[PDB]
Amino acid sequence: SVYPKALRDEYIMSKTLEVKLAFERKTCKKVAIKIISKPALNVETEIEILKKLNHPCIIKIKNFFDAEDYYIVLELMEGGELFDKVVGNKRLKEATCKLYFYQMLLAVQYLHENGIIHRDLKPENVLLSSQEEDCLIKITDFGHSKILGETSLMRTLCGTPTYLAPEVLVSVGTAGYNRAVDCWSLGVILFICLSGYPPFSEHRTQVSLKDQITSGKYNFIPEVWAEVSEKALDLVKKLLVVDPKARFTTEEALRHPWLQDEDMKRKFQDLLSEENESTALPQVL
């Protein structure tokens, strides 16, 4: 198979990284083109979302092609995937874990604020802006994302439940906390970043991964965790809470002591203006 004419007309395709590297002809700038074979639903959704959202720590869509396959043009992230930073028990310096996690929270906070649930948060979907270890991170892959509204339960709650089944009335209790699944994923991510190993795995253990996760009983190795602060460990503890309604929200996390770090936040504000310099159009005074 070859690339669609319409694509080749604006872009020069290059290496693979499914995601390949491409060059926009008009600008000679680098771009990342994600190829998705033909699904429509998950692709329609992702596009609709990418177009509506705009936030520093959220990947932006530049172009899109509906051909024999789906082609999604995105801004290229020099840093690559966060996954390559933690694979094989690589341990990230805490100060940078914080810097990253802060951005992740801002992003997921943003999504939730806008009624979006990512649902597939993992190191593979966190992109770094540069080869520097101090950089911007951006969230990506909204193919599994969910959008909210009307819920139909609301619609049913408006009517008399004479003929309504018990399980549905019961569901009222927990309705509206689906977003908490993202906060779980973050907790699991932050755990990996901080310690270099996953909190729930089948490595040297006789309990099923399912049991570990539902019981919330993660694998805790003091030797490794001794290098990490108490504040950092505490936040993870409050994200890996089994009870969704008790689990921390992004807001509660952003307020947690471990995140009250001006040096880190400053460094973040600086990384922004840096990237925004090129885009800076003169302002009225």
120, 134, 243, 263: the active-site residue:
120
Catalytic-residue membership of 243? no
Cα 123 from Cα 137, distance rounded (Å): 11
Determine, following the binding rule CB under 8 A, whether residue 169 of this chain makes contact with its own copies: yes
Residue 122 contact, options its own copies, ligand RU5, none, Cβ 5-8 Å cut-off depending on partner type: its own copies
Q: Which residue has the tokens 């755990």?
A: 191
Adjacent-strand bridge partners of 278: none
Q: 17: buried, middle or exposed (CB in 10 Å: 19+, 13-18, 0-12)?
A: middle
76 known ligand binder: yes
Three-state DSSP string of 206-235: CCCHHHHHHHCCCCCCHHHHCCCCHHHHHH
Among 161, 227, 255, 260, binds its own copies (CB under 8 A): 161
Cα 88 from Cα 84, distance rounded (Å): 9
Please choose, from the candidates 23, 19, 14, the residue with its C-alpha nearest in 3D space to the C-alpha of residue 35.
19
Determine, following the binding rule CB under 6 A, whether residue 85 of this chain makes contact with ligand RU5: no
Nearest distance from C-beta of residue 22 to ligand RU5, angstroms: 11
Nearest distance from C-beta of residue 135 to ligand RU5, angstroms: 11
Among 12, 13, 21, 241, binds ligand RU5 (CB under 6 A): 21
Residue 139, amino acid: I
Residue 161 contact, options its own copies, ligand RU5, none, Cβ 5-8 Å cut-off depending on partner type: its own copies
Among 21, 96, 216, 237, binds its own copies (CB under 8 A): 216
Query: Under the rule (CB under 8 A), what is the footprint of its own copies?
Result: 121-122, 144, 152, 160-170, 174, 180-181, 184-185, 188-189, 198, 200-201, 209-210, 213-214, 216, 242, 244
